[PDB]
Design a protein around this nucleic acid. Structure first.
Ligand SMILES: Nc1ccn([C@H]2C[C@H](O)[C@H](COP(=O)(O)OP(=O)(O)[C@@](F)(Cl)P(=O)(O)O)O2)c(=O)n1
Ligand SMILES: Nc1ccn([C@H]2C[C@H](O)[C@@H](COP(=O)(O)O)O2)c(=O)n1
Ligand SMILES: [Cl-]
Ligand SMILES: [Mg+2]
Ligand SMILES: [Mg+2]
Ligand code: NA
Ligand code: NA
Ligand code: NA
Length: 326
DNA sequence: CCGACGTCGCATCAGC
DNA sequence: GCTGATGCGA
DNA sequence: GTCGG
């Protein structure tokens, strides 16, 4: 990409701040600057040129000048050499190991893939499954495989109850040619913002997908969110497909547009859009858009009849999902 | 200068 | 058990 | 780390 060296550098800094420094606002700031630079349609010639973009300030402009001049950033050259940061950054690549657990594992002398496998009983359930599929979860999913997965999920959901609607969101809904995982939004007319007239609505779908051996493992599961593992079936003599991460979110049916806006993302798009909502006097979550009083307290939910209704409230022109890959 | 930075589900733990 | 952080994830 | 009041 046009500015890929710069955006990779800022992403690596973002990850350092999240995983090692445990500085969540610096993580978000670096990711915001990387995103706005990734969409900038010119090859950046200087830090000052980048500083014009919102989210790029003085410090990143200086790093961009060092990176343009040398092809490298000394700050990151040193981070790469620090064994503690190297260890923590590896360990946090296991699903379920976050910055806190990674640093505690390092204190205990658990710092390598071999150390983790030797100490499975020091892992919670999520982490144990993250370790099992460590290699698989860094592989990307071709859209062609996403389409096969979509067919299975949609048809199995229809067999449980033809009134379910499952919608694949995430980068797939933004039209990406490959995805890191599969995100499924689920609705049923029995579950609305006003009542839950039938229990186990998510459970029944999960159990059906386990029954046909599509869902293979569970990371976490509650009444409205499933986080787990799935796998396409392979044909005779074929090597098996990698196991994939799957997330299923059951959303009140009358709140589908706020739910599908949220689950379509990207994550940075959502942060930018919700931050703009706040500046406009609204707050948006996956359920509603509500006004803010002078209070600072959220009012009653506003009527939403399309994704574009949400954009309208905050005075944004509509952006199709394919234009939300921030 | 400096307060705010998106919003929330599930797992886990501490305190009572 | 309940409640309220905290961690980790979407 | 950046921004806006
Ligand atoms: N911090 C987050 C993370 C996710 N999300 C929402 C938006 C996003 O599209 C996301 C789906 O989560 P995921 O991490 O799978 O993000 P994707 O957009 O699907 C992806 F592009 Cl990173 P992919 O999963 O395809 O690699 O849920 C969010 O709002 N905030
Ligand atoms: N998972 C879903 C997807 C769509 N829908 C409903 C919301 C709208 O009334 C209707 C329109 O379909 P679509 O917008 O997906 O073209 O589908 C739902 O209730 N649950
Ligand atoms: Cl709400
Ligand atoms: Mg995804
Ligand atoms: Mg602000
Ligand atoms: Na700027
Ligand atoms: Na992790
Ligand atoms: Na996901």
């Amino acid at each position: 990409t046009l500015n890929g060296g710069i955006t990779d550098m800022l992403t690596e800094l973002a990850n350092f701040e999240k995983n090692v420094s445990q500085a969540i606002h610096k993580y978000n700031a670096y990711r915001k600057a990387a995103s706005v630079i990734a969409k900038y349609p010119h090859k950046i010639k200087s830090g000052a040129e980048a500083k014009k973009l919102p989210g790029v300030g003085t410090k990143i402009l200086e790093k961009i000048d060092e990176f343009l001049a040398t092809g490298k950033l000394r700050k990151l050259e040193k981070i790469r050499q620090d064994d503690t940061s190297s260890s923590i950054n590896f360990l946090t690549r296991v699903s379920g190991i976050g910055p806190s657990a990674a640093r505690k594992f390092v204190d205990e002398g658990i710092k390598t893939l071999e150390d983790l496998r030797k100490n499975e009983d020091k892992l919670n359930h999520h982490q144990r499954i993250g370790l099992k599929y460590f290699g698989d979860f860094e592989k990307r999913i071709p859209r062609e495989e996403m389409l096969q997965m979509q067919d299975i999920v949609l048809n199995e959901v229809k067999k449980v109850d033809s009134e379910y609607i499952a919608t694949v969101c995430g980068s797939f809904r933004r039209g990406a040619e490959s995805s890191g995982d599969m995100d499924v939004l689920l609705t049923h007319p029995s579950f609305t913002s006003e009542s839950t007239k039938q229990p186990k609505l998510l459970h029944q779908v999960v159990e059906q997908l386990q029954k046909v051996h599509f869902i293979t493992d569970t990371l976490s599961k509650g009444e409205t969110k499933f986080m787990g593992v799935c796998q396409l079936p392979s044909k005779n003599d074929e090597k098996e497909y990698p196991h994939r991460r799957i997330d299923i979110r059951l959303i009140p049916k009358d709140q589908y547009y706020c739910g599908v806006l949220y689950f379509t993302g990207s994550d940075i798009f959502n942060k930018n859009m919700r931050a703009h909502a706040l500046e406009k006097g609204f707050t948006i979550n996956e359920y509603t858009i509500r006004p803010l009083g002078v209070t600072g307290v959220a009012g009653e939910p506003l009527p939403v009849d399309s994704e574009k209704d949400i954009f309208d409230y905050i005075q944004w022109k509509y952006r199709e999902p394919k234009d939300r890959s921030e």
